[PDB]
Structures are given as structure tokens and as C-alpha cells.
Write a protein that binds this ligand. Sequence first.
Ligand SMILES: *Cc1c(COP(=O)(O)O)cnc(C)c1O
Ligand SMILES: *Cc1c(COP(=O)(O)O)cnc(C)c1O
Lengths: 925, 950
Amino acid sequence: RLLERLLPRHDDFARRHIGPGDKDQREMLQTLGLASIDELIEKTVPANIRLKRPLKMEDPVCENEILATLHAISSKNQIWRSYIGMGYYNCSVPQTILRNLLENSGWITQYTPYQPEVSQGRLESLLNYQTMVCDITGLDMANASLLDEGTAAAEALQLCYRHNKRRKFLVDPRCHPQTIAVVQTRAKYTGVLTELKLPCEMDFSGKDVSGVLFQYPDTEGKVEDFTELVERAHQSGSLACCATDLLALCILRPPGEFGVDIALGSSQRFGVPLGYGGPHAAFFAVRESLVRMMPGRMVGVTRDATGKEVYRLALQTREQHIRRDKATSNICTAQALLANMAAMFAIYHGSHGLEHIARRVHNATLILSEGLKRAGHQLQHDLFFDTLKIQCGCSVKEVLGRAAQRQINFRLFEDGTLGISLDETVNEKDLDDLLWIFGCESSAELVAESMGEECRGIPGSVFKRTSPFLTHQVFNSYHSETNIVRYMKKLENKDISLVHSMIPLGSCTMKLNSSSELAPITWKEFANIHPFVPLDQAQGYQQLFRELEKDLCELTGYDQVCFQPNSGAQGEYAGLATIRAYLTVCLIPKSAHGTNPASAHMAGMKIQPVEVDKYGNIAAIMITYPSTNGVFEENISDVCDLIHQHQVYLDGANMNAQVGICRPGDFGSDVSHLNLHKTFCIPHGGGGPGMGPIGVKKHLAPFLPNHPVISLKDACPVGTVSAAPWGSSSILPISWAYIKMMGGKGLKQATETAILNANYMAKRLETHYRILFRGARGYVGHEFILDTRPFKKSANIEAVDVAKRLQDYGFHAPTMSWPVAGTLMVEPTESEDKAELDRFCDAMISIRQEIADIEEGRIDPRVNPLKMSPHSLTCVTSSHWDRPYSREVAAFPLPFVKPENKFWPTIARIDDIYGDQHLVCTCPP
Amino acid sequence: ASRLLERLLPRHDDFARRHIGPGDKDQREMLQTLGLASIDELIEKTVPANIRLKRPLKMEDPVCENEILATLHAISSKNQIWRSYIGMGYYNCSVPQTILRNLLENSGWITQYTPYQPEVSQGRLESLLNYQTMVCDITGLDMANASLLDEGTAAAEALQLCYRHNKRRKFLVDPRCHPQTIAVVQTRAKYTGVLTELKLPCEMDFSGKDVSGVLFQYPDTEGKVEDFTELVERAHQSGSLACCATDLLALCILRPPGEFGVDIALGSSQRFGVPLGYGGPHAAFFAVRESLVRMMPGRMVGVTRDATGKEVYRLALQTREQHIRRDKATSNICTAQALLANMAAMFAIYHGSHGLEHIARRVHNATLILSEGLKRAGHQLQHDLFFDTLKIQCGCSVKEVLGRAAQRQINFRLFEDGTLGISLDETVNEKDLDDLLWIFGCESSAELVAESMCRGIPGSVFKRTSPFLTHQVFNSYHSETNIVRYMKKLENKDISLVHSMIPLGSCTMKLNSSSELAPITWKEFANIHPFVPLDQAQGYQQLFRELEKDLCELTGYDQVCFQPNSGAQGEYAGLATIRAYLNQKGEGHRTVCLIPKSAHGTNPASAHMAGMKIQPVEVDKYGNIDAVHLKAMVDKHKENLAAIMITYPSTNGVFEENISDVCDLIHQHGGQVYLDGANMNAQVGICRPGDFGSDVSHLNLHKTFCIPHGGGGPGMGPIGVKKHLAPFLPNHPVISLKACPVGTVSAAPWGSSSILPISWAYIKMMGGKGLKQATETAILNANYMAKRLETHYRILFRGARGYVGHEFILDTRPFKKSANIEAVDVAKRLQDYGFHAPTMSWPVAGTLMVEPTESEDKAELDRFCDAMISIRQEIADIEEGRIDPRVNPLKMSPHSLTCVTSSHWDRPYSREVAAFPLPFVKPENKFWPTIARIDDIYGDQHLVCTCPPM
Ligand SMILES: *Cc1c(COP(=O)(O)O)cnc(C)c1O
Ligand SMILES: *Cc1c(COP(=O)(O)O)cnc(C)c1O
């Protein structure tokens, strides 16, 4: 149009997202000996599996309009005061943690702390989170987060099965309903029988029961003594698992002190938004003797090469990347970032501030309780923390009518009674609205005057907490705003992130997490809605779900998406369970991510491994296209046809090599998870949050996950896989914004440049290191493997030496020893420009020459920069220097590493064995 | 006495507990160190009894931090965000979100102040050098400063520069300059003694050789692009200078002032990625020819060497500024708009010349399109050639147009003569063009108008053909990934409040809280045009009233004027109001202003700018105003006495015993009392300047009331006045503030309105109790530090009973004789201990002045005292011969990373002593000075004030 020539688009976000401009791409193409981008794709991606017609999507939205566009959606939501409860409680998110951690690119762009020596910040903070959970729950050791409350409870069930092998598990029906549904789904496919029984109905006599799950306080609000239940279970060989609340436990005697084996719940009310379901770090802590069976990551204390006390992920042999189908769970990405928010919450308040918040909430509930009783309403339970169950003396409708006038939501119980869960945000004004809602012609002031100040409730009961918590210096040091900012910065600056340098982690897609994408996750219209609100309050979210679904259906070739799964691994489990509901043998290549076999074990499938040939190539199969080695298989249609002849799950984690070029649904796949936090810009967050939505073909849609609280429907659902119906809803705007900004053209170009960048790097490094696997005509997809294994024989150099030595050149290492042990796998993504790629290649080329010096007797084979790496500031600034290379070689190996940009590894090399032999997983004194 | 509810259900939080560092335990220990039982005893012994409050501050109940944003939202949502195409120097722009998030809302960019200590400030120094380079390239002039306050104040500075250059008393102003620009220039001329004349180029008479300079605008306020070559040449042939107000976006496609002979180019940098802000803050630009640079106002970054010979940055030719030359300085300006200059530089780095040309072409073509649509519809365009601004005579009724405009919530500029101004901007899309065309009754769409259309600037002789932004810095960081990395690189070179206490005397480096900062980027504050109709800014009005009333109550004044956009502007404004009052009263012969020699350099400069005869008053050996010399000087000038400028407490941190007497004395002899409020952090909740005889004070919101220091701006300097001065307070020619106004001192009626919420939020969160406690702890902390250092260094001045206020001076001068150690040695050596130095060599040369503020806790204060105590022992080593006097830690400081990690080490102390002097300085928190010691003389001898190659 002539308008478009006179008045072009204001901006094109693809130009900001994609690093290499025109000049870079031409030069990279010259380096590959190719005339154009299309030629590269034609020589990489098999012709017969490419798209017929280009992605059909909306015209791209300029970056300078994306927030107004999205506001037109989010403003459709209504922000009521929700006192629904059910595991989500509004809280006061300290603005300084929101600003300096959540909206800080130096906290949120890094991923899992695999490389500890450039990750001590987030490792300390996750150690703070564990310490907090252990102190408050009263149990011995806690993990570095699970996905949500209900999954954490399923993991408790699974832990119990792993401990004693018994096929029965008793559930208290007073657990939250979404918790029950997720535990029953896991039990169903793991082969364990669950029974809904109250403590008095629970029969342990038969010595068949693995464990019991109850809640404290329970879903109705009641505080109950489980000492006797726990003792009865113990005398019959069963374990006792307790879902709980960290705020409640600030004044309640905790599960640890009435014999509980496993304590779990959500950390959400410790300073994290409602988020319309997530993301929230769940907690999960166990007795000392159960720790070998712990799920997820767990920070421990160890030594470095100098003997300094330092942090690192401990007992890693439990996890998916080592033990695969024999692992303690399929979980990979958890909710590291939001665990760190909650730990900062507890550091900022201290035990003293958490007691103040908890007492205040409880007294506000006690006050409301007396007001309602005065007015002729009936309270079902005398002792509670923050939650009342009310039989209305007057009409329930007229109450709800008034409640609607003050825009307040209650929990509507099946039996016609009401749930009210007060929280940290509740003040006098709200109590007055609440008392007016129930027709009590008395204010909160006046009700309080005739209560007196004899202690009542929890402080006046035998359930009074007497044990201390958060006595470590870290929880009693950073209470001024000035101090917490300084502390958050100190830990930030220890962690190498995307504000520093490329993090080319294979199968992680460390691409740009844009500001404009990130902004909306802290908008009140997304962050401050309770997941279980009536749907007329969440019509903005509905529209977001539809638009993102439709877009994702179009990129993948599937028919319907389910947002419920809140990690890739959860999507695999969900996808496999949907295949089983539609219908047990699951074929899995040995090249598959460790989540693949673990998910299948969790979904109750018999795993048959399939071998990989020497060129790297190969109820259901799990495939990945491209290969977890970055190579496109020539005849993937044939594999899909073959399985269908006798369903096909396709792992989507490598979709950044596909988008706008080919689609898994077009070539025979029935179901895929997508990693939104890897391909679609959700921030990696130090190891979470992520989302793992599954696209399915028409025929699987009737069996997709449902939810017992908010209904997601010929339906025949597999069950329920996450605590919240659409998982971590509040981070979904990030991927919607990427997609709507990029458009069809931009998304295609991003995939193009991801492949270009990976091949350019491989090309540059091919005469220095072996590129282990390639496609039929020699080209890789979006990543490649450098075979460092030969340097073991020639120089006694291991991949780990190269990993640590890279830190000295200003780079986080690529992915290590997977899919192939003793190798590096490299994924630059599209967001990094030529000069950044050239620095990484030059660092590797220079390291190659260091290996050559050892291979040639030019430098001591025991004491060289590779074996002594990383080189800390304390090492390099010491007066003591007794090494046969200079300090310049150690810390500034090439001229692009300058004092002006020098990132310091904060410690010497990590000792892996020592920490697991001296297991300490709480902040030491 | 409390309600039962308040005991069962106390306040959710108290922000004073987060703002004030020392808790109960700290304060008890500090009190023990002072030998005092309680806080009240301290105050009783510090602040004289007779000037203290008779009753507590009467203020609203404090607002919990967890409700402050909801409370403020109830005010801000009263504003209406229309699409404003008013123009008049403010043009909506698309603020790149990544710069907003990673710079504006980064505490690592905004908490630091003026880059006095260059070796821990190279980041923001490079960025200000980027800003200068950008201005110089785009304007085509030789050297630019590191920001002025706004467009109109920059134009007044041009007038003043011209007077300084040639001493002629006439200055010609084009009436097609923006009206607020004219009003601010006329106000400055009025009190400086220069006569302005409003004359069009053809009416301008340069032939008498009595014209200092001329000011015109390009494009002018009506939108027109005109050739000023001949005007400039005529002025030059008669000895006058030519000053040009301009627009940086416009100049991306227009040949700039540099290429038609202009001597001074200025304007606002606001379009380059900074919000409308309902007036501010925006960095103004100001650039000059090579030969005029000695007379430059403000700061200016220059290139120099460090001790190793490395190329590095620092503030250049500092002898021009207020802190050195005082009343002989090139201006009174101190705090400028450093942070917003850095935003605009990042804007230009992110877009490059190529992206700025794209934005500018797009805006211009959007205007050309609108232009053809209006002509088709029967409306008359007054000027053929424009950038983004049309002047329209409506073919139909103006009312029916404005009626329709109101229906699409669009504002135009209403000219006095019944015509309309429309200024398009970067935010204007097809949809808006269509609304605009519908507004004027053109039934054609933008698409259709465009189909029947190079013309405009590209088709004219005004086409820009000169390049700009050819340096690598403007062609390197176009990916979002790169610009984030670049902003971080510069952030991490700058020590800030995310690292350690910055105890800068006379700066009040207190907490800039997140919850206070959050609202400044709310659309309801950030995206309103300063000249909108007032029914669109009723939230702002309510904010102004509430903050005014609160500030009136803390100060004892009757009315506040928010127009002045720095403390120094408030001084100038306050002094000018005193002169207008005196003129009204029959007493304009009174021009003498008495100023103690201890006064901030802004004091004498402001008085010179306001046209007062300065008489210095001496200070005695005890640090007080010399009562004999004062009495003499009062008597000498009693018939001509206009004012005194005092500071309570003194600029040395001491409370004067008889300040009432000083005020009474001046009032006895026919003059008014101006009180410099910059030290109000020692007063709030305890005493009030209005109660003891003061008539007028500026307050520094960016010092006492939590506005972020921003690397040297932004600030606000509101003046409180007594009833009798209120009729003479500044007004504004566009939005009426009323009366017999002094004139207009800032471009925007309430200055930088969008940062005012920060101080409102501090005040409403703290309450009467919290504000008092903050002042209490500021005084406690300062005395505790002085107490701990008194046997190692001389505390130069104290109050009558031995106690200081909120700051104190360490007399380091004796170490010159005993060890050949200068204050600067101590300043640089402190960097090695992880601290930015305190304020240096003012009020007393060769000394350090220390202000911890209330926001820092005991352990942080103890770290600073231990660093000083340890440095004392280093000085002792030189005094007693234990270490070389030339080569020791103090003389070699700061110690950079490159120095300490070198293989070559030839110093008589260890690397550990150099970089980790005490155990609290650890690898895990080590802040590195990024360069060796700065060479001060070399840079001023080899003046280079733009980014050098590569
Ligand atoms: C990264 C990745 C996953 C991620 O699973 P999460 O639970 O989201 O961490 C799964 N599969 C493959 C092949 C991956 O590369
Ligand atoms: C900071 C200051 C000023 C002027 O403030 P600006 O905002 O920089 O103009 C005046 N007097 C004293 C004592 C100051 O500290």
C-alpha cells in the first residue's frame, strides 16, 4: 500500500529480538559458503516435512503498541477481594523484592545453577528457602521447590510407595479438592489405590498402607491434633504426610513436632502474587532418613579447591538427568525464582515480622468470628487460623448479594455453607464490609471492645507454637529496605546471567526475555486474581488463553492446547496419561532427555529403550525433532507411520528449530509439550518458573486434563495434573507477547537465525573440535555437540575442565555430558549477534591451544589454566602465586576480557564428592 | 489510650522501620557510645530550645506501605490520558521499555549523585559523554553540556552567556519562540538588567551594535521551517551572537543550526525516549561554538588520562561552576537532569542515526498526509514547510471541530487568533490520522489521502545532508540483548546505594524507596501533556494541594510554589520574589543581599542571577556567622538591604544558637530573610524555619524528601513563602497559577510534576511520628560517627554544647604538614575500603564533610568509621617513617583491578592491604574502582568533550 511506504511500521520487534542484522548474516553465510538463508534451510531441514503454506497469523504488533493491545485484554478482568482460600491467599508483595528481584534481568535470565562457581547467589538464596521451610515445618531437610501444592502431595504419595512398596494410600477428604484430584491422578497411573477416609475411618491394621495424607489446618479451616493418627500409622509401618501453610505455622505447632514424616504446601503467601494460579514455589520437606528419596533439586554445603565453605546442588544422582526412569521424579524445571522471592520475604520480615503478620491475620479472623456469632450465624469449627466455615442464620442469597455489592468472593461449599479465608491484606475497613455483608449491626471496633484481651484461638490453645524459627543471621540482618536491596544485589552480582554474556546451554534456548514481554506479569489485572474466582471476573484471561491457544495450534499443527501442565515434564506426564486414557509399552530412544523415561515411569508405562545408530539417529513412542543432538532425522514421518501402524508423543523442547518452517502435527505426531520458558521467552528464573502446555490432535482432546474446582470442558478427562486449572496463568502473557509482536515472518526469521548461528559456530569450530553429529548433508539444527572426549587420552582433559575454564573467558558453559557423556552441547539461539558468537568461538579456539600446550609438553599437565579453573578473584589478587602461567593468562586470557567487564567466578573449583559425603542442606552458623 | 481493635489488629507495617536503618538495639548502643540516656536528651543538647516546635507536626495518620499505591491510585486515576498534539515543546514519544526497566527503574543507575569521584563513576560519565556527542552531532555545534533544566531555562542561559561575552544590554527575541520560553527569558533579563525586545527577524535592528544576541526557533512555535542564514549573518556583522531553540527529532532530517552559522543551539531532549511527565523531568540540551566554551553553564564531561595513562572520563573545566567560582560562576545551576540525559542518550544508542531518521521521516510524512487531508477538506494551512506541526485556519467553525476532537479525546493547541496548532509525534499511527481527518470533516482515510500524494523537508533546500551518530557507540547496541548488556556494563562501574553508604555532606543520600519510585512510571502521571486543559489533570491538582499543605506544615510557611525545578532555581525564584515584594512596597532601591562565606556556592550565584549586590559576611573561628561583622555589614547597608541568605543548620552541620536574632536584625533594617532548606533533614519534626523569622526557603526534594539523585538530577526545589510574599510568586503564561507575579522561572508551571509523587509518598507513609524519628536518627547517626572519630581526626565545628546536627567536618588539613597527605588522598583511598568519599573541600578547603543520613544502620556506620580509623593508622605510618612517603597506599589509591591482578608488583605493601584493607572488604562484595587515579589538570589542558574514536 502507498500508506505503508509513506508511513511504514513504527518498529519491528524481530530486529530487537534477533541479534544478527543484515551485515552479520551475510558474513556468516559467506563463512558457510552459502548464498542465502533459504539455501541453508533447504540443506538442513528435509524438504518433504516443511510447511506447505506459511504460518497464517495476525499481522505483527509493533513493540510500541503491544502493552496497549494487551491492556485491552487484561482490563476485562475484575480485581475483587477474594477470601476464597483453597491454598491461595492474597498477601502484601514487598515492592522492593518485586522491583529488585522479579523485575531484575540479573535475577531472572539465568537458569539452573549447574555451574556453581558463577551461581553462588541463587544457590545461597535457595539454601535460605530450604532453611526457612525446615525451621517453620520442623522437619530435617527441604528441597529447592516443587511446582505447586497438589503435585507436591502426589510426590509425597510416590515417595511413600518408593519407601515401602505398599499399594494403598489414605487421603483425608478435608484436603483441598485440587490437591485430592492431583494425588488421585498420580496414584491412578502409578498403580496405587487411594481411599478417601477421615482419621477415625482410617484402617492401618492390615499393614498394607503406604502412607496417609492430611491437612493442617484443613480445607474447612479446622486445626486438629494428628498426634494419635500419626502414631497409629507409624505402628503399622506407614508414613504420615501433612499438607500445611507456612504463615499458619508461624503461630501453630508444626508437623515436625507431632511426628510427621513429610510436610508440604505452597510458599505463595510469603510475598508472591495470586497469579491466577501461579507461579508459586511449593515446599516439600522430609525426615533425615527419607532424604535419599527426595524429589527435585536440593542445595547443599560443600568445599571448594581451597577448602572454603560454598554451595552447590546436592545428591544429584536422585534426579532425572542422572537416574532417568529410576529417578525420584521427572521434575526438571521447578520454581526457583519464586522460591527465592519467598525466602526474601522471610528475610525481610524475620521470624518477628512473620509472627506479627500471622497474629494479625488470626485476630482479624477471630474478630470476624465473634461478629458472625453475635449476628446469629453458626461457625462449624472453634479453632482455626484464618479460615471459617459458616452456616448462615439468614438467607445465603442475600449475603452473597451484599458480598457482590462490595466485590468480595467467598468459597461456596457443596453443602450450602460458606468459606471465608482472611489474609495479610485484611484491615478494619474490610472487616467492616464483611460484618455488614453478614448483617451484623456492629463494627470491627465495637466487636473488639467486647472481646476484651484475654488470649483466644491459637495462642489460648494447646496448639500454640513454642519452638523458634529463623534464628540464623540471614533472617535477622536485612530488615531495612537499604539492607535488603544490598543483599539482593550482592547475590545478583555473583551470578552470571544474560545481562553479561551468551549462555549457550544446549536444549535450554537461552534467548531474549524482552522487557515489553515481561512488563505485564506484575500488572494487577494479571497478578492479583484468585485462581478460583467466578469466570466473569477473569474474561481477560479467557481471551488470553484462546488467542495463545489458537496461535500455538497454528505453530504446531495441533487442534487444541491444554495450559494446565506447569513444566515440560508435567506436559510429558500429562500427554502420556492422555494417551493411556484414550487407549502400556512406551518406546524411548536412549538419546531422550531424562524427563522422558521418568515421565513414562510416572505415567505407569513399561519403558522399552531404543538404541541410537553411530550417526546419532534412532502404547507410544517419545521422539524429539530435532534430535537431542541438534540433528534433523531424514525419515521422521516413517517413524510416526510405523507406530501408528501398530500413538506418537513428540518432545517440543527443540521447537526453536521448527517454528515457521515445519510443524510436528503435520508429520504424524499426536501430542507435544512445548517449553514456553525455552522457545517462547518465559524467563528461566534460576531454574523456574516454566510452562509446558500440550497440543493434541482432535482425537486426544476429549481426554485432556480437567480440574475439580473450575471446569475445563463427549469429555472423558485423564484427571487433573496441576493445582490450578491453567497452571501459572500470570506468565502466559510473556509468550503471547512474543508471538503477537514477532508475527509469522518474525517467528520464521528467528528460527532461521537460530539455525544460522548454530551452523556458523559449528563451521568455525570444526577444525578445532569434532562436531559429533550432523545431518545427511552436513548441517546441524539449532545446537551442536563438541566431542571433547579425545582430550582425555591426549591431555588428561575432561569436559568439566573446559566448562570451568570458560568461566575465565566470561562465559557460562554450554550443556555438559548430555546427550553424550564427556561432551559439550552448544545452543546460541537467535538473540545473540555475530560478535558475541565470535567471542565464544575464539574462547574455545584459545582453549584448544591450551589443550595443545598440554598435549605437547609445553606446560605442566597437573598445573595449567584448564585444571586450576575457574580462577577466582581471591586466587588472582593473592600475594602468593606459584603457577607456571601468568595472572593475565588466568583471568584475562584474550583482549575482549577486560577489567571494565570482568565477571569474577566467586570461588575456586567445586568439590562434588565432599558435599554428598558431608550432607548439610541448611544455612550453616 | 489505644482502641482494643488497634491492640488486637495493629498497623500492618510502619514504613519508618524500613526507611530508618538503626532499630532499637542499634540506637541504644549508639546512645551508650555518646553517654546519653535517650534520643530526647540528644535533641535537647543539639537543637536550641527556643526555636523548637511548641506542638508536634499536625499531619494525617501514616499510611502503611502495603496501602500506599492504592491510596495514590485513588488520586492519579482522576487524571485523563488524552492524545495530546498540543506541541509547545513537549511531544509524546515511545519510551523504549528496556531503557525504562533497566535504567529508570534500576536502583544501580538512579541512587548515585554527581560524578565527583570519577574512578567509581566512569559508567554515568561515559553515558553523559554519549549525550554530549549526540547533541553536538545533531545540532552541528562544537561542544555541549551534560544537561540543563528545561528549554526555557536553557534559552535564558543563552541570553546570559551573550551578556557575559559582549556586555551589551539588549537581547532580541523572535515572538515565534514558544511562549513559556519567552516568559523565562524575559524574567532572567528583567533581574539581570538586560532589555529584551520581541521582534520578528525583519523588525530586528542590529545596526546600533548594542545587541548582545538574538534568540529564534527552528522549527518555530507555529511549525514553520525558515532559513535564518541572513539573520545570523546580519547579527554577526554587528558583533551579536545568534541563539537557536530547536528540536532533536526535527534535526534528524533538517539541516541543523551549526550549518547556518548559529553560535548557541538549545532545546529539550524529551522526545528522545522520555515521558511527557506533565512538565518534567527532561534533560535540556545546550551546545556552543568552540570559542564560547569558557562561558558554558552546567557540567560538561571531558576526556583525560588516569595515573597509568589510560583514556578515561571526568567533569571538565569545573572552575566555571558554582562550587568553585560562586557569584562569578557561569550559572547557579548545580543539580541538573543527568538521569534523563542518560535516558535520551540510550534512546539515540538504541535507534542509531538510522532509527532516528526512520522515526523522524515517519512523523513528518504523517504530518504531510494530515496536511493534504485538511486542505482537501477546505481548511487553510498557514505554512507550507514544517516538520511535525501545522497551523490551521478552519474553513468551518472552530467549535464544531473542537467538539469532535473532544469526542475522540484529542487536544489541539488553541491559538489566541482562533487558529489551531497540531503537533504530531512518534506515537501517531494510521488510526490516529483517521480520527484526526474525521475531526476536520475529511471523509477520506489516511490510506486514501496517501495514495494521491518526495515533498516537504526531503523535497526542499532544508534537506539534511550531514551525517550524525557515526561513532561506534551509536552503531553497536541495537539488539535488546546488547543494550541491556551495555546499560549493565556502565551500571556496574558506578558505586551506588545498592553497594554502600555514600555519606556526602550536603546531599542527604537517604533511601529512595521502591514504593515511592513505582508511581513515576504510571501512565496517569508520566503520559500527560503539561499544557492539557485542567479538567484532565485533576489528580495532579489534588497531589499538588496535599503535598503543598504537608510541606507548609513541616516548614511553617503559608504557600508553596512547585515551579522551581532545582534548589538553585528555588533560590533564584525566592530572591526574585523578595525583589518583586520590595518593588511593590516602594523600596526597589534595596538590592543588597548579605551572604555568609560558608554558604553553598549556589547562594551567591543565585543572587547575582537575581540582580542583587552581594555583601559577604564572615564566619568566626567557631564556624558561626560572625556577629560583629554582621552587625557592621547590616549598618553599612541598612538603607539598601534586601535580604540575607542563611542556612539552618549551617553548612558545617552546626545549629546556630541565636538564629531568631539574626532574622530579627534583618527585619529591623528593612530586608527579608531567605533560608536555604538543603539541610532540612536536621529540622523536620523538630523545628521549622518559618517559626523563627524566615520568609522564604527552597526545599531540596531530591535530598531531604527521597527523590533519587540520578547521577546529578533530576531534582525539585519548591519554595515555601510567608503570606506576604505569596502574591509575587512565579506564574506561567500558558497555565495560570494565581496577584503581582515575579515572572516565570521554569518552562512548565509545576516543574517536573511526575517526580512529585515520590516526596508525597515518603511524607504520607512516614507521618508526623516517622518524619520526626527520621530527623532524630539522622542527628543520632551523625553524632555517633563524630563521637567515634573525634580522637583520630578533628571534628572542626560543633554546637554550643558540643553536638553536631546531621553532618560534620573532619579536618584532614594537618596531615598536609605531617605526612604530605591531602583530603583527596583520603577520598581515593576510601574507594579501596568500598566507600564513595564524603563531600570534599567545601565548606572548608582540604577537609571532608560527612552526612550518613538516617537510612543507614549502625553496622554500616561502623564500617565507615573503621575505614577512617584504619586510614588514620596509614597516615601514622607515613608520619612515623614506617612506610615510604611517596609510595604508599594513600598516594597510590584508588587501586584498580588491573593494578592488583598484574604480574608486575613493585610496591612496599601487599595486594591484600591495597584491595582488602579490613575483613569486611571481601571478594564476594568487592567493588572495583575501574581506573587508577584521575589526572585533573591534564583534561582541562587537552579539552576533548565528545566520544573519542573506537
Ligand atoms: C529442557 C527440556 C525439558 C524441560 O522439562 P521441564 O520440566 O520444563 O524442565 C524437557 N525435555 C527436553 C528434551 C528438554 O530439552
Ligand atoms: C544541594 C544544595 C543546594 C542546591 O540544590 P540543587 O538542587 O543542586 O540546586 C543548595 N544549598 C545547599 C546547602 C545544598 O546542599
